[PDB]
Amino acid sequence: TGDERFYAEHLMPTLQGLLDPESAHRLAVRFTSLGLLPRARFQDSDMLEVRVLGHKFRNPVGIAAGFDKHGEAVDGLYKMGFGFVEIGSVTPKPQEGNPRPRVFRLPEDQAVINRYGFNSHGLSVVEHRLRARQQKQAKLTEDGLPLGVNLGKNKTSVDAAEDYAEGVRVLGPLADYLVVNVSSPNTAGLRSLQGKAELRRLLTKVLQERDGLRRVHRPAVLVKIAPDLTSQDKEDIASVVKELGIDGLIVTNTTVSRPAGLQGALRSETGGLSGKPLRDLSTQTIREMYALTQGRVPIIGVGGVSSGQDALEKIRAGASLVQLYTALTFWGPPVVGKVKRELEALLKEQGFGGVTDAIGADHRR
Ligand SMILES: Cc1cc2nc3c(=O)[nH]c(=O)nc-3n(C[C@H](O)[C@H](O)[C@H](O)COP(=O)(O)O)c2cc1C
Ligand SMILES: O=C1N=C(Nc2ccc(F)cc2C(=O)O)S/C1=C\c1cccc2ccccc12
Ligand SMILES: O=C(O)c1cc(=O)[nH]c(=O)[nH]1
Numbered sequence: 076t077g078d079e080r081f082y083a084e085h086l087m088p089t090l091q092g093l094l095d096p097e098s099a100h101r102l103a104v105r106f107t108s109l110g111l112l113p114r115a116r117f118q119d120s121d122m123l124e125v126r127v128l129g130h131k132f133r134n135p136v137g138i139a140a141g142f143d144k145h146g147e148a149v150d151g152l153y154k155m156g157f158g159f160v161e162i163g164s165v166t167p168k169p170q171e172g173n174p175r176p177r178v179f180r181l182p183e184d185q186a187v188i189n190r191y192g193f194n195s196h197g198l199s200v201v202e203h204r205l206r207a208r209q210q211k212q213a214k215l216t217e218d219g220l221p222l223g224v225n226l227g228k229n230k231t232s233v234d235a236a237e238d239y240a241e242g243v244r245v246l247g248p249l250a251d252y253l254v255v256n257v258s259s260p261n262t263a264g265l266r267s268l269q270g271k272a273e274l275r276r277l278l279t280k281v282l283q284e285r286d287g288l289r290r291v292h293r294p295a296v297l298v299k300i301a302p303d304l305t306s307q308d309k310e311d312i313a314s315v316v317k318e319l320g321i322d323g324l325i326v327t328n329t330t331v332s333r334p335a336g337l338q339g340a341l342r343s344e345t346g347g348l349s350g351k352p353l354r355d356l357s358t359q360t361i362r363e364m365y366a367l368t369q370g371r372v373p374i375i376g377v378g379g380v381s382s383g384q385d386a387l388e389k390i391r392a393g394a395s396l397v398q399l400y401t402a403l404t405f406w407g408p409p410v411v412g413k414v415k416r417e418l419e420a421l422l423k424e425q426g427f428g429g430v431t432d433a434i435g436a437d438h439r440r
Contacts, residue, residue, distance in 0.1 A: 077306065080112070082407035096187070096404075097316035104143060107151035115156040117342075117412035120178065122419055122429040123158070124219065125158055127395045128252055128295045128323055133219030134158030135430050136261045136414055137339075139377050139400035140225040140254065141189075145196040146204045150211070153220050156411040162201070163225030164256050167241045169197035179228040179346070181339025185381070186353070187308070187401050190261045190330070190346035198206040205249040225299070227259065233267060236280045236306045248292035257283055258301040258328035260347040266301055267440035271311040274298075278319050300364075302356045302378060303332055309360075314320075315368035323373040324366050326394070327357045350401035354379025360394050362437070365393025370435050376431040381410060383417020389436040390430060 099203055106112065123134040124421025138152050139157040146162040148171060168239050172194030179188045195201075205212070205222075212222055226242035228235050239255055247253055255278065259269040278298065285296050293359055298321055300312060317323065329347025337352060365374055376394030380386050381402035402410050418430075427433045 076284065076409065076413075078116075079406070079409040079413050082409050084375075087405060088409050091180065092317070094178065096109065096180050097175060100142075100178065100348065104148050107143075107149035107155065110151050110154055111152065112155055112408050114154060115412060117156055118417055119158070121428075122422055123415065125395055125430050130216065130221045130222075130251055131395060132158045132221060132312045133218040134386070134415055135390070135396040136418075137161060137223075137375070137396060137398040137405075139398035140164055140256070141191075142400055142403070144194065144281075146201045149166045149222065150208070152216060155408050156415065158219070159249040161222065161223035161225055161254065162257065163196065163254065164193055164227035165198055165201050165224065165242065165246065166193050166195040166227045167198050167232070167238050168229050168413045169200065170195055173269070177346070178342040178398045179339075179344045181337065181341055182405075183403075184342070184352050186337070186339065186348055186350035186403055187404060188341060188343075188346040188348050192261045193230070193259065198242060202245050202249065205246070209249060216251055222249075223252040223254060224250035224294075224299075225254040225256050226263065227256050227368055228262065230262065235265075238275045238279050239277065240284045242279055247294050249286060250294045252295040252297055252322070253285070254297050254299050254325055256328070258299050259330060260301070260331045262276035262400070269300060269304065269308060269312065271315065271362070274312065275315050275319070278315065278321060282319055282321070283378060291297075295322035297302065297321070297323040297325050297375065300327055300360070302330045302353060303329040303358050310367060313364060314370055321372070323362055323375065324368075325375045325377060325398075326361045327353075327378050329353065330356060332356070346412065349378070350405075351379050351381070352393050354385060358389050361389055362396055365435055366438060370438065378379075380414065383414055383421050386414055386418045386427075387421050387433065391435070391436040393438065395434050412432045422423060
């Protein structure tokens with residue numbers, strides 16, 4: 076399509092020439108929150124529908140956490156064509172995050188590196204903002220357009236588990252699913268919450284707070300993990316996830332690795348790397364986690380998705396849903412309908428009646 080072509084060849088290069096990546100992101104969140112976008116050409120077919128996590132998803136393509144950190148553009152994101160929206164990460168108290176510059180474009184790699192550091196308006200602000208549209212969301216969700224909320228922890232916090240428990244209490248009642256983000260590379264000590272004993276203690280507390288919410292306000296709880304785990308780490312996560320009945324996994328966050336071959340001048344900036352160089356590392360983490368949980372723990376696959384093929388590879392590896400974030404940054408809004416359209420064509424070509432039939436198909440070969 077000409078829209079996709081116009082953005083890819085003209086508008087996006089012009090926008091990257093004019094604005095640093097943080098400004099462009101802020102501007103994009105502002106435009107999107109105002110609805111200043113086309114509106115979806117692409118009409119979702121029934122093949123794209125997925126039922127998982129106690130919900131219907133009209134399509135399996137979501138916006139990853141980090142784009143709409145503070146819950147300001149949710150409605151414009153559904154308008155862009157995403158089948159579900161995840162906001163956050165949200166910390167209990169407001170905090171500024173790291174000094175700028177803290178986001179970097181690696182155009183030659185179709186990659187970004189970021190070290191935002193959980194810049195967040197905080198739970199109260201985000202709570203009031205979601206409350207103002209709570210019933211509009213309840214109808215969106217009933218219509219197949221769910222909302223997730225991704226929870227983080229304050230930089231100076233002296234008890235991580237209590238930060239996450241507060242998140243559960245405050246935003247849990249407004250969310251279809253929560254994410255316990257234990258995988259940011261930009262918060263000191265955070266990723267060590269993924270180890271066995273810490274993780275079990277942490278998630279036991281999270282699930283207990285979730286279980287004490289009223290039934291209609293009780294979300295699914297997912298754990299978002301890194302692409303950089305050891306085999307031991309992964310085995311331990313899978314075991315805990317099964318022992319506690321965690322509802323799902325988000326696989327993966329950004330990488331602290333720098334794969335060989337990066338060309339961008341900014342490749343040695345500190346931060347998490349996203350985009351194309353993360354793609355297969357993420358797909359393989361998905362593959363492993365699905366096998367370790369015997370295909371019984373729903374997985375939302377994320378990292379380097381910019382095409383229908385990218386998405387279908389994660390689905391066949393075991394993802395029930397996918398997300399993207401960095402591709403939007405390079406190709407703009409038209410990438411959303413593009414991924415959905417190609418995914419549907421590939422599903423037909425490969426003989427799948429729908430997305431659901433493809434889920435984990437590589438493990439049954
Ligand atoms: C600028 C930026 C900010 C991000 N912030 C968050 C965040 O606050 N919480 C989170 O769980 N993941 C965050 N992510 C990670 C994305 O949700 C996603 O896991 C990762 O970028 C891989 O997907 P992608 O290759 O499609 O961008 C962020 C990513 C980027 C690029
Ligand atoms: O040019 C753009 N750059 C974007 N983001 C970024 C660009 C570079 C970077 F290092 C990081 C980001 C980021 O979001 O961290 S988003 C965008 C364009 C649009 C994206 C979404 C909605 C829009 C709506 C209207 C106009 C442009 C956009
Ligand atoms: O710095 C952040 O806020 C952030 C970046 C990132 O890549 N992942 C994450 O979970 N948080």
